[PDB]
Amino acid sequence: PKKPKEPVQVPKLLIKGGVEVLEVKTGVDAITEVECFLNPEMGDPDENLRGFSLKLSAENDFSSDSPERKMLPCYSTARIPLPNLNEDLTCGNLLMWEAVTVQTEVIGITSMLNLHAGSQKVHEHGGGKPIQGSNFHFFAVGGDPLEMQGVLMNYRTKYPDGTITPKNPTAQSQVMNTDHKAYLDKNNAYPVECWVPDPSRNENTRYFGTFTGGENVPPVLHVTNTATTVLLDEQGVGPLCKADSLYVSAADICGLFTNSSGTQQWRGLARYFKIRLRKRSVKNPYPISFLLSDLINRRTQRVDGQPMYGMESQVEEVRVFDGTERLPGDPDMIRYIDKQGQLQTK
Amino acid sequence: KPKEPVQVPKLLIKGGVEVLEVKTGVDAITEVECFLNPEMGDPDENLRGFSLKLSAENDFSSDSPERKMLPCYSTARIPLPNLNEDLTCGNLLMWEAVTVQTEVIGITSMLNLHAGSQKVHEHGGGKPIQGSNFHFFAVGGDPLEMQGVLMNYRTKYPDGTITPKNPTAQSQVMNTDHKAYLDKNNAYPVECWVPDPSRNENTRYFGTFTGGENVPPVLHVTNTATTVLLDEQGVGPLCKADSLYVSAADICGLFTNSSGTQQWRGLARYFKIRLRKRSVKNPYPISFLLSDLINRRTQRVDGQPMYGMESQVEEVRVFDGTERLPGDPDMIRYIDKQGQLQT
Amino acid sequence: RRTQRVDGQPMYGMESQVEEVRVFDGTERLPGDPDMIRYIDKQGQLQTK
Amino acid sequence: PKKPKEPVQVPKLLIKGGVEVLEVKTGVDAITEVECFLN
Ligand SMILES: [Ca+2]
Ligand SMILES: [Ca+2]
């Protein structure tokens, strides 16, 4: 009979599955879609109370402030190992993965409608006080770890041992201080109150975040599977995965949970991620003399000689002779190249 | 001299749900209009759309809510016909939800301040409905696959509600072992189930949450809004089964009684879905009908596990083509999976 | 051998947090099954006992 | 099989550093990016 119209050519799914699926030898124009999540690291004050913090210390002195480790929300971070694009390119070309498109979402937003759960009674015969207060929703997707900046308040706070902090803070550390650069290289260590992502150094990641701080503000959360964030820059490239690794970071403080006794503690939710990848032809920016210099420096013996480089060097004169010239009248002449051209002092 | 009238797509038949079973042309557009009543708990027969009054300070150890208090998801299924007549092997011809146009019915009912609301101050009127609210809808060709995230995993739920099974402290956050579909009305409470951000490949769910102790419900009401259900490939939710699935959950705020006992308020939600006929590759050919026939006539074997977490298949080498002989039989694929990086 | 070693959340192994990986290669006529399920009976359901 | 394309032409980075790059003489069609802060 009458045949239907030909269906539109969609991309062909090869294999769906878990993380073991990435190993498939595909072609050049393959695209993968990694779907994952991150759990919030809110402090977890005992084994029964995951996702909350410990209760807040109310009024510490500004000089003798010493918080504890269980009441500090920290950043979440993770590395997704990607397989190598083992190819046979010419003239110093490669292939790397490119984070083209992220599609994120907070998992568990309607759980905040639980009002019969030890929350503070809202009025005389009311229900429970819902979760509200200062909230912070952050996510960062890139091919390198999240390079961040240590900016805090009250540099005289005595942090505990588990949390990694800005090293030797001064009064300058209560505003921008260039000495407090660090990476995000550890889950559940870097607290949110000390570490903002570095606006000067995240050349390979794409970090997005918003903050709203009040005594009682509404946590407004949208949930949708059609929103889509493009991770491309002005040149049309995304986060390139230098080492075959995809770095995913997040921080989702949703508000303060007020207990029945009137004692507040934080609340965090998970964060879905969906990164769309592809294979980018790049060039090798580095010469072959970086491969061979690393091979030699781990097979040749380390010699503790006399210093032949530095401020106490023992090499006195080096002269480079290339090409022929007419005989100059000054043998004790001095010759070099200043900025671009050959110069000749005396 | 005036011109001819413009070409408008010709209406054929208007009516109820029985218009669906009419066999039409292949280039036919169907606009189904329906609604969903809120399953807010309904504490007795004379009070619909409310919930029961809220319990206040049940601690985490001993927390047992009641059945009529928890607002649950609304869902329904719209029976669509089957469209092929002969085999026509290769391509098939399914429905496709192109455009939803939704709306909450009854938003000006919240102007009723002479009802059982609490007196707002010394001689004022009633206190309006405000507080935590959540407006949600989903349109797809599958039931709304959803993820179980709650707080207070030691909550003892009633028997009427279906909840995430065997919760741990990991269930107070994202736990992968709480997958379920939305195939039952008034049993999946909203405080336990968010729609699954990974597994809904055939629905289009839309939702806004707005917490807070007293925030205004802001509800627009318009018949010129239009939501496009197409993905980045240009296809809407295909109806695999001969059915269209419609889900919603409308919480509009807390109704404060004269005694002070707060209780929820929900409203209905309009749906206007455009359906066209799209030609797809047949997911159920003769070979599927063959293999499903021999499936049902084969003896069930309860043997040792060969799939899942406790699986006993160790290694599968799938290999098809030919290859020049490698210099590495166990060729490494990840340069560094576990991490032999610096510092 | 020069990248910073992060110690993050388990994105590999038994306790992995990657939920799903799709891999696409070429073009295909539009399937009528958007969750392209392969096993006609993976669990063993709808077999005769 | 199928070979991947050539890489995309991006603007060539020349020199990266602190304040001392704001002394270097550059070309006519040179595009600098000054990154700074104010306390
Ligand atoms: Ca920079
Ligand atoms: Ca998915």
Element holding B269 (H helix, E strand)? strand B268-278
Going by C-alpha positions, the residue among B134, B102, B135, B103 that lies closest to residue B229 is B102
Going by C-alpha positions, the residue among A173, A178, A269 that lies closest to residue A223 is A269
Chains touching C by CB (3 or more pairs below 8 Å): A, B
The SS3 of residue B293 is: helix
B contact residues 258-287, partner A, Cβ 8 Å cutoff: 259-262, 278-281
Q: What is the resolution of this structure in A?
A: 3.4
Q: Give chain C positions within 8 Å (CB) of B240.
A: 32-34
The SS3 of residue B286 is: helix
Asked if A257 contacts A129 with a C-beta cutoff of 8 angstroms, the reply is no
Q: Residues C13, C18, C23, C29: is their CA dihedral positive or negative? A: positive
- Tell me how far apart the alpha carbons of residues A304 and B224 are, in angstroms, rounded to a whole number: 81
The SS3 of residue B291 is: helix
Asked if A277 contacts A97 with a C-beta cutoff of 8 angstroms, the reply is yes
Domain map of chain A by residue range?
Answer: 1-346
- Tell me how far apart the alpha carbons of residues C22 and A226 are, in angstroms, rounded to a whole number: 18
- Residue B263 forms beta bridges with which residues? B255
- Amino acid of residue B330: D
CATH superfamily membership of A1-346: Capsid protein VP1,Polyomavirus (2.60.175.10)
- Residue B76 forms beta bridges with which residues? B246
Going by C-alpha positions, the residue among B66, B55, B60 that lies closest to residue B189 is B66
The SS3 of residue A193 is: coil
- Tell me how far apart the alpha carbons of residues A195 and A183 are, in angstroms, rounded to a whole number: 10
Please name the residue that has the structure tokens 């049309």: A236
C34 part of contact set with chain A, CB < 8 Å: no
Q: How many helices (H) and strands (E) does chain D have?
A: 0, 0
B289 part of contact set with chain C, CB < 8 Å: no
**Span from the CA of C35 to the centroid of ligand 2 (angstroms):** 9
A107 part of contact set with chain C, CB < 8 Å: no
State both tokens at B124.
């004022």
Q: Which of A12, A39, A187 sits opposite C26 (nearest CB)?
A: A12
CB within 8 A of B113, min separation 6: which ones? B125, B126, B127, B128
Q: Give chain B positions within 8 Å (CB) of A217.
A: 212
Asked if A346 contacts A330 with a C-beta cutoff of 8 angstroms, the reply is yes
Going by C-alpha positions, the residue among B272, B280, B276, B234 that lies closest to residue B27 is B276
Q: What is the DSSP letter of B288?
A: H
The verdict on a CB contact (< 8 Å) between A186 and C8 is yes
CB within 8 A of A89, min separation 6: which ones? A95, A281, D4
Residue of B nearest to A185 (CA): B343
Asked if B282 contacts B91 with a C-beta cutoff of 8 angstroms, the reply is yes
- Tell me how far apart the alpha carbons of residues A139 and A322 are, in angstroms, rounded to a whole number: 56
A288 burial level (CB within 10 Å; 0-12, 13-18, 19+): exposed
C-alpha distances out from residue A13 to B197, B229, B320, Å:
19, 22, 18
The SS3 of residue A141 is: strand
Element holding B74 (H helix, E strand)? strand B74-79
**Span from the CA of A35 to the centroid of ligand 2 (angstroms):** 7
The SS3 of residue A295 is: helix
State both tokens at B311.
């699986």
- Tell me how far apart the alpha carbons of residues B190 and B184 are, in angstroms, rounded to a whole number: 13
A228 part of contact set with chain B, CB < 8 Å: yes
Q: Which of B210, B254, B335 sits opposite A218 (nearest CB)?
A: B210
CB within 8 A of B340, min separation 6: which ones? C1, C5
Going by C-alpha positions, the residue among B193, B80, B192, B202 that lies closest to residue B141 is B202
Size of interface A-B (CB pairs under 8 A): 222
Q: D with C: 3 or more CB pairs under 8 Å?
A: no
- Tell me how far apart the alpha carbons of residues A83 and B319 are, in angstroms, rounded to a whole number: 18
Going by C-alpha positions, the residue among B85, B96, B70, B232 that lies closest to residue B158 is B70
Residue B22 dihedral angles phi and psi, to the nearest 5°:
-75, 125
C-alpha dihedral over C23, C38, B313, A38, to 10 degrees?
50
Neighbours of B16 (CB within 10 A): 6
A295 burial level (CB within 10 Å; 0-12, 13-18, 19+): exposed
Chains touching A by CB (3 or more pairs below 8 Å): B, C, D
A93 part of contact set with chain D, CB < 8 Å: yes
CB within 8 A of A171, min separation 6: which ones? A155
Which DSSP string corresponds to C1-49? --SB--B-S--SSTT----EEEEEEEEE--BS-SS----SSSS-TT-B-
* Strand ranges (E), chain A: 10-13, 31-38, 76-81, 93-102, 105-107, 135-142, 148-150, 181-182, 195-197, 205-212, 220-224, 229-230, 245-258, 264-268, 270-283, 334-337, 342-345
State both tokens at B153.
């995993």
Q: Which of B92, B201, B337 sits opposite C32 (nearest CB)?
A: B92
Second-level CATH architecture of B1-343: Sandwich (2.60)
Structure solved using which method? cryo-EM
Q: How far is A276 from chain C (nearest CA, A)?
A: 9
Going by C-alpha positions, the residue among B268, B254, B31 that lies closest to residue B129 is B254
Q: After which residues is chain A broken (C to N over 2.5 A)?
A: none
Residue of A nearest to B337 (CA): A81
Going by C-alpha positions, the residue among A105, A79, A23, A94 that lies closest to residue A205 is A79
Q: Where are the alpha helices (DSSP H) in A268-341?
A: 291-296
Asked if A141 contacts A239 with a C-beta cutoff of 8 angstroms, the reply is yes
- How crowded is the C-beta side of A11, counted as CA atoms within 13 Å? 14
Q: A with D: 3 or more CB pairs under 8 Å?
A: yes
- Tell me how far apart the alpha carbons of residues A297 and B30 are, in angstroms, rounded to a whole number: 73
Element holding B287 (H helix, E strand)? helix B286-296
Going by C-alpha positions, the residue among C24, B304, B38, B54 that lies closest to residue A276 is C24
